[PDB]
Design a protein around this ligand. Structure first.
Ligand SMILES: O=C(CO)C(O)[C@H](O)COP(=O)(O)O
Ligand SMILES: O=C(CO)C(O)[C@H](O)COP(=O)(O)O
Ligand SMILES: [Cl-]
Ligand SMILES: [K+]
Ligand SMILES: [K+]
Lengths: 233, 233
């Protein structure tokens, strides 16, 4: 069902991939359907060099013969292909549910275009039902927590703020950080929330991608695969 | 002679330290004059608990019997005592010459008041002669260098952006990050530049402390010690 929708979305996004392209490769279950398809194309002659955004995306790339490089070697990419936890107005996204948002966000900024692949449930009228992830420094995290609570209060946001755990330890990102998930339910002013969060010293990054996504490739329940632009949101 | 001025600033700031305060302890050569003095007061029965902002400041704290705790234990501090590479209009700071900007800014943020201690030379009419430090993520650092170069162009800034070295190994901060020093020479729009840099995914933080300092204690070559407020800048 959704796995079907994800694969459909992935197949269609794959049509925009051309020879000698440098690609950003995102993370999550939808991108995991895209990587092997890409590898099948590479085994049939397609030339690409990819930058992965997580260890599991990188693993899959190696496994399926997708050539892998780094942003040190290729600082500017042609196209980024990634998923999203949510796609809202102007194709603002929430990402980071799998914990890879930092590398994902850096890779998206380094790309001439970012295409989002998704099944229709990711499309929302308003952002926020999916808890916003917020990458934070371990040092002074308690004070960073208080600062995010107070910023939430000022902006009229309500909901638990939870430290993401891996069993008994905090979950630690690739960049060596921790993550807070903020269950704010509705984010009406994402540009203001993003500015307020980034200004907090202990906040490394957050999962609101604003004006980064250029196309959303969304597979619908009725089998339509729509190629959408930010004006469609 | 400037060492004298540093001590004079430190002695004066020490007078605002009262029994049972929770103190932030900054870093730098000026703060290195303050810690032993504080230690000498502790020997005499003054009671304080300090959060240090660098390894060297913590080392000096232990060496002089200044008690040490964490933001985890004490999330909100009464008073932060720190130096500054520059003190400009509205008491905006540039900090991070010694490499400790992130922990310094988290601590500053977590305090009720922040006191800057400085010799006369740090007061500037316009910020920017001192290279602005920018803490960045190692992942995608090349891409981040480019995005900073682009943000600079948009704000009309020019100059070399060099990576902080410690040997022929990039200097790694306590947060596990690298630092770019931006030799822009002049920064007339510090708030816009702050907003811009923080929006760049790989930028963890930077050395512009805006509306964080509440008093500057500045020792002048004529022996005056001025206790100054942001209204005085
Ligand atoms: O990288 C991600 C999280 O770090 C995502 O792409 C996001 O979580 C969406 O994943 P999915 O494709 O499983 O919906
Ligand atoms: O921690 C600092 C740099 O990280 C500072 O306090 C700033 O660099 C001022 O240094 P100094 O007092 O040595 O002139
Ligand atoms: Cl092909
Ligand atoms: K920040
Ligand atoms: K950032």
């Amino acid at each position: 069902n959704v796995q079907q929708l994800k694969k459909m979305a992935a197949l269609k996004a794959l049509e925009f991939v051309e020879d000698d392209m440098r690609l950003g490769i995102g993370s999550g279950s939808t991108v995991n359907e895209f990587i092997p398809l890409l590898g099948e194309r590479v085994a049939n002659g397609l030339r690409v060099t990819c930058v992965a955004t997580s260890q599991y995306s990188e693993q899959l790339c190696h496994k399926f013969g997708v050539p892998i490089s780094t942003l040190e070697k290729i600082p500017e990419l042609d196209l980024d292909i990634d998923g999203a936890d949510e796609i809202g107005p102007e194709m603002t996204l929430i990402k980071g549910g799998g914990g890879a948002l930092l590398h994902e966000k850096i890779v998206a900024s380094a790309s001439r275009a970012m295409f989002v692949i998704a099944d229709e449930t990711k499309m929302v009228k308003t952002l926020g039902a999916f808890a916003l992830p917020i990458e934070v420094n371990p040092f002074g995290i308690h004070a960073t927590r208080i600062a995010i609570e107070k910023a939430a209060d000022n902006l009229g946001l309500s909901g638990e703020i939870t430290l993401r755990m891996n069993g008994d330890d905090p979950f630690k990102t690739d960049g060596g950080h921790f993550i807070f998930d903020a269950f704010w339910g509705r984010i009406l002013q994402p540009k203001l929330l993003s500015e307020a969060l980034l200004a907090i010293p202990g906040v490394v990054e957050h999962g609101l991608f604003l004006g980064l996504a250029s196309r959303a490739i969304v597979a619908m329940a009725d089998s339509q695969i729509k190629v959408l632009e930010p004006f469609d949101f």
